[PDB]
Design a binder for these strands. Structure first.
Ligand SMILES: [K+]
Ligand SMILES: [K+]
Ligand SMILES: [K+]
Ligand SMILES: [K+]
Ligand SMILES: [K+]
Ligand SMILES: [Mg+2]
Ligand SMILES: [Mg+2]
Ligand SMILES: [Mg+2]
Ligand SMILES: [Mg+2]
Ligand code: NA
Ligand code: NA
Ligand code: NA
Ligand code: NA
Ligand code: NA
Lengths: 133, 57, 142, 100, 149, 70, 183, 4
RNA sequence: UUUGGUUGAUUCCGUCAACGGACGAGAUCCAAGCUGCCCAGUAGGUGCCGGGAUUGUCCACACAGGACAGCAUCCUUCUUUAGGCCCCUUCUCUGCGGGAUUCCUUGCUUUUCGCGCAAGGUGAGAUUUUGGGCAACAGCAGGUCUGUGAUGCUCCUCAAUGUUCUGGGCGACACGCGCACUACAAUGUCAGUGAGAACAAGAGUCGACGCUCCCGCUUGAUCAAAAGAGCGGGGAAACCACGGAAUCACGUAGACCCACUUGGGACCGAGUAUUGCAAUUAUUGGUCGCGCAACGAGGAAUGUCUCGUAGGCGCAGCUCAUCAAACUGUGCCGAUUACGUCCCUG
């Protein structure tokens, strides 16, 4: 029931993605590629941000605190099984990929299978379904 | 506007489909008339006739 | 020094409710442990409550009612309880009281609802092969 | 529960005959007999398509098989109980004598 | 006066009072006291794999333990297999028919451990857990507290 | 639909200025008279009932109905 | 002692009447506590006319593929509708429902027999009245913020007043006007 | 399998 | 063996160049709903006698807190997976039986009669009681030589169309058609608390001295799910089991508010555990991402259905070493319309 602060802003810019001024904080971070729900809840919990703030008052320090949490999730006691790339078939590292880096790794995987000339690679090249369907 | 009549007796189901029944109704004047009724109808029921001047055979 | 007790029962679909009515220092009605006036669905509370509200609470003055229900879902259990209660007071009043006092509450019961004293004989219909249920059939293609 | 005798078969008439005359064999000694108990009846059902080649309308076929079980409690000395249980048994009825 | 007592009927028991109100009061008592230990697994896990999202109530762990106390109170000798049945749901499986799933038995083990540490519950030999004398006293004292309120 | 999400002054004053005169008060209706979210309307109505300017008639988990106090 | 039953413990059945003498025998006003009956009302041809009027409105609410058989939900929706009606009208809610059913169905219809105008029996008048009210409210609350309990109250009130801003009344006029010119 |  | 009435009925009454008979319909059989005997250490209850917990002169009554029982009565209630005894068979179990017959009124019925109809009453049930099962005589060039140590003629028959092993395929996609599942959201989605079903199933008659099948309780746990491990039970009315199913309910002072959005979950990336001699063409289950894939209620056309039914919601069995959007059954919530006609199709 707090009055609008006149500093309320729309399309909050974060991680090179426009994030709606409305919507609760967990469901606004869901619009950043790689985060998704059930991860934005952990991000807000570990950044000390209430999940009932609706991005109306997201001061630059709070955005920076959020952005540094997602940058290194394991530094804030996020379990390894709670992550995007668990063991990285190429590098051999555990990390979380977000914000236009997941797509780059996706095209890296597709070309890696093509050079291998595995069955999954050739089916991807022809545009067919790679699972059993 | 509307005249209320009472159904005295029912002849039977008319029409090819059998969804229309034929009844004899007395106005409320003792003048009886013959009308076609749509829907489930019974003796002693009351209708609301818009015009009560023409027979329906 | 003396014990007054009756046992009745009622069934709706497959629920069986057994009610025990005895003389107690103060009236109490408990359904499966939790007392009445605490059953969460207010609609189902009204249906059970109407077993006493039709004849009035004066006839339930110092009677203790204990009911146990088993089987058949949620709504069907409420209906079995109200029937076992209604049959209970009538059975209790049949003895320990004159015949004129009885059949003065029965008419009030049967006027309001026949099922308050007579069980509903409806049961589920068996499924038959070649049908998705008792009645509906497999789709035809042409 | 001194002596438990359980009978079960596929013929209700045969089961009833064995129990009834087992009681008179008991009633001729003055044993202490707990009355016969009728355990729930069990039916085995098998459903199968009627056709041998998968053609026409899908018509099925439901078969059943009923099993009757009875229980009798006897409280008597062993060498005596064997004398009662030495009766002739109707065909198709099995009898199990157990002690708990 | 909704708190005026009828003739006789002194005191109260857990089975009498409204169930949700007792749980809410019991959960606050656990929180306000502070002896209950909450594991560091109580911020990431879901209640069951049949669920889709993590609990939205900040006091969900305190609420759950109070409910576990109530269930053991009602049914002595219950185990983790029984408690998973009590807390079930339907799982959304996509373009497939829904199916019912039980609560994870790992979390219920933690809930029983916290209650045992709070000497509110003890395990029967060769069976599940039952409630102790202190646990029975705690539940009934709160139930009478609500009736007077 | 351009419903507001946070209470603002002009709508803020209009909550105690015009709403209490209404004969029937519902979150669905209030969200129409003042261009606010239905979630916001329900909070504002609960705010007014605590103040005492309106009276709650029917209460339920999903539906609430309020009317003028006098 | 025993007191007269009151619907939802707030509304009384006493001093109720039907201004249309045609429908007087087909609208039931026996006092009840709740719209839940669970009786065999379809065994005989005319036995469905003995269901209390408030119950018939409850039955019509649960229609679509979602909602088939949700009687308890329908009772809750009906219950919240009555106070909105009572606040809007300052009159007994059951009286308003009785009036709306009376004036919500066309008294003259046209059927294919080239189409020729015919009459409408009392039972069909009551049935079609309730059917059009639920259908009008259900389509108004779809993809709308208004919600159903307060969508149904407005249309029932509008129908009782006879205003043309109602699905029931607007359809009734169109049917009657067509039947006139079709004869 | 694939249908389209 | 026709015509006149009646019946679901070639079911009956009457008439009659026909009279006597056989099948089919009806009856019989199974399962439900009401009841009688017999029943208990595998089903259940009632008193007391112990033991355990809470307990008010007023007063206080949720942060905003409301509507619905008990009070001329002998004494407040709950539990006993610290339990001893006494009385029992209403509820459960079921092998034979009773119970329904147009029985009783009123009105219609070929000129009477006869055969019978409709409304009501008795009643647990009131018209084949409700569901099934069985079902004649004639046929079809309907299907099956892929069930059999059912089989005639005719093919291959030792570098085989016999038999066995290794590896593939039966699943391949520009497309078209039948049948299902999931949705297009507020009568909703997500997160919590409450009460709560029936049908059922479970291991040896070849292999490790013991087991194989189905489950319960702990521990794993100073830290996910998924699992390894200890300890036991059940041959099944004794174990799983007080069978805590899902729709459902909640005055939860919960989250969202009309947008392809927290609606919908297709497609795809990475890590793990299990079944199996063997998982790539992903067996399966679980975790985090992708959600910018259509889809906003569907043209012509078209399927099923009349009371515990339609629709909605789950569970078990079967197939099964591992896989159910299928089928066979089971229960749970539970309606609108008609009680007609021969217009369409027969
Ligand atoms: K088919
Ligand atoms: K023929
Ligand atoms: K195939
Ligand atoms: K199949
Ligand atoms: K025809
Ligand atoms: Mg001939
Ligand atoms: Mg051929
Ligand atoms: Mg979703
Ligand atoms: Mg979306
Ligand atoms: Na869904
Ligand atoms: Na579904
Ligand atoms: Na709506
Ligand atoms: Na006929
Ligand atoms: Na051959």
């Amino acid at each position: 029931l707090t009055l609008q602060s006149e500093s309320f802003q729309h399309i909050v810019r974060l991680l090179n993605t426009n994030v709606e001024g409305k919507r609760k904080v967990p469901f606004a971070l869901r619009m950043v590629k790689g985060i998704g729900i059930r991860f934005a809840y952990m991000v807000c919990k570990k950044a000390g941000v209430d999940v009932e703030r609706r991005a109306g008052t997201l001061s630059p320090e709070e955005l920076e605190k959020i952005s540094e949490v997602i940058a290194d999730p394991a530094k804030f006691k996020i379990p390894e099984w709670f992550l995007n790339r668990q063991r990285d078939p190429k590098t051999g590292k555990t990390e979380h990929l977000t914000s236009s880096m997941v797509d780059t790794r996706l095209r890296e995987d597709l070309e890696r299978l093509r050079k291998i000339r595995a069955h999954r690679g050739v089916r991807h090249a022809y545009g067919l379904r790679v699972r059993g369907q | 506007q509307a005249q209320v009549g009472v159904i005295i007796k029912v002849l039977g189901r008319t029409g090819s489909r059998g969804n229309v029944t034929q009844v004899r109704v007395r106005l409320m004047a003792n003048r009886t008339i013959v009308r076609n009724v749509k829907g489930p109808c019974k003796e002693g029921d009351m209708l609301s006739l818009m015009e009560t001047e023409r027979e329906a055979r | 020094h003396t014990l007054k007790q009756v046992q009745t029962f009622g069934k709706k679909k497959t629920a069986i409710a057994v009610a025990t009515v005895t003389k107690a220092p103060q009236c109490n009605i408990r359904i499966n442990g939790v007392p009445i006036s605490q059953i969460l669905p207010e609609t189902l509370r009204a249906k059970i409550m109407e077993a006493v509200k039709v004849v009035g609470a004066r006839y339930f003055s110092r009677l203790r009612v204990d009911v146990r229900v088993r089987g058949s879902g949620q709504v069907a259990q409420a209906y079995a309880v109200r029937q076992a209660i209604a049959k209970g007071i009538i059975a209790y009043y049949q003895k320990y009281h004159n015949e004129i006092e009885k059949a003065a509450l029965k008419d009030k019961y049967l006027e309001y609802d026949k099922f308050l004293l007579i069980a509903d004989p409806r049961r589920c219909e068996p499924k038959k092969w070649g049908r998705h249920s008792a009645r509906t059939r497999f789709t035809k293609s042409y | 529960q001194r002596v438990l005798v359980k009978m079960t078969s596929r013929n209700a008439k045969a089961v009833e005959r064995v129990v009834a005359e087992l009681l008179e064999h008991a009633r001729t000694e003055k044993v202490e007999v707990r009355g016969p108990v009728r355990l729930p009846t069990r039916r085995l059902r098998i459903t199968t398509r009627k056709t041998p080649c998968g053609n026409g309308t899908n018509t099925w076929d439901t078969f059943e098989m009923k099993i009757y079980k009875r229980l009798v409690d006897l409280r008597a000395s062993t060498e005596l109980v064997k004398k009662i249980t030495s009766f002739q048994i109707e065909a198709g009825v099995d009898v199990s004598i157990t002690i708990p | 006066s909704k708190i005026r007592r009828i003739g006789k009927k002194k005191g109260a028991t857990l089975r009498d009072v409204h169930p949700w109100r007792w749980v809410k009061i019991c959960s606050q008592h656990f929180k306000q006291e502070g002896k209950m230990m909450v594991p560091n697994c109580a911020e990431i896990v879901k209640t069951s794999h049949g669920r889709e999202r993590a609990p939205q109530n900040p006091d969900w762990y305190y609420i759950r333990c109070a409910a576990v106390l109530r269930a053991v109170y009602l049914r002595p000798g219950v185990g983790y297999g029984g408690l998973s049945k009590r807390f079930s749901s339907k799982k959304n499986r996509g373009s497939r028919p829904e199916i019912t799933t039980r609560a994870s038995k790992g979390l219920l083990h933690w809930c029983c451990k916290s209650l045992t540490k709070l000497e509110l519950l003890e395990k029967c030999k060769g069976a599940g857990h039952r409630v102790t004398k202190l646990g029975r006293k705690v539940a009934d004292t709160i139930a009478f507290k609500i009736a007077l309120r | 639909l351009q419903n507001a999400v946070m209470f603002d002054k002009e709508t803020m004053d209009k909550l105690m200025k015009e709403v209490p005169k209404y004969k029937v008060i519902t979150p669905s209706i209030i969200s129409d008279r003042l261009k606010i979210s239905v979630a916001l309307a329900g909070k504002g109505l609960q705010h007014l009932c605590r103040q005492g300017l309106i009276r709650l008639v029917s209460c339920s988990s999903k539906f609430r109905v309020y009317t003028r106090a006098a | 002692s025993a007191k007269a039953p009151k619907l939802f413990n707030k509304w009384s059945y006493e001093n109720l009447q039907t201004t249309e003498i045609a429908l007087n025998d087909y609208i039931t006003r026996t006092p009840t506590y709740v719209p839940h009956s669970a009786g065999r009302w379809q065994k005989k041809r005319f036995r469905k006319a003995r269901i209390p009027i408030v119950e018939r409105l409850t039955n019509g609410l649960m229609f679509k593929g979602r909602g088939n058989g949700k009687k308890l939900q329908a009772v809750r929706l009906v219950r919240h509708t009555l106070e909105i009606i009572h606040l809007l009208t300052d009159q007994n809610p059951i009286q308003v429902v009785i009036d709306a059913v009376s004036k919500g169905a066309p008294r003259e219809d046209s059927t294919r027999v080239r189409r020729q105008a015919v009459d409408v029996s009392p039972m069909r008048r009551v049935n079609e009245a309730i059917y059009l009210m639920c259908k009008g409210a259900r389509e108004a609350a779809f993809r709308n913020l208004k919600t159903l309990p307060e969508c149904l109250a407005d249309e029932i009130v509008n129908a009782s007043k006879g205003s043309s801003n109602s699905y029931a009344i607007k359809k009734k006029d169109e049917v009657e006007r067509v039947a006139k010119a079709n004869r | 399998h694939t249908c389209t």
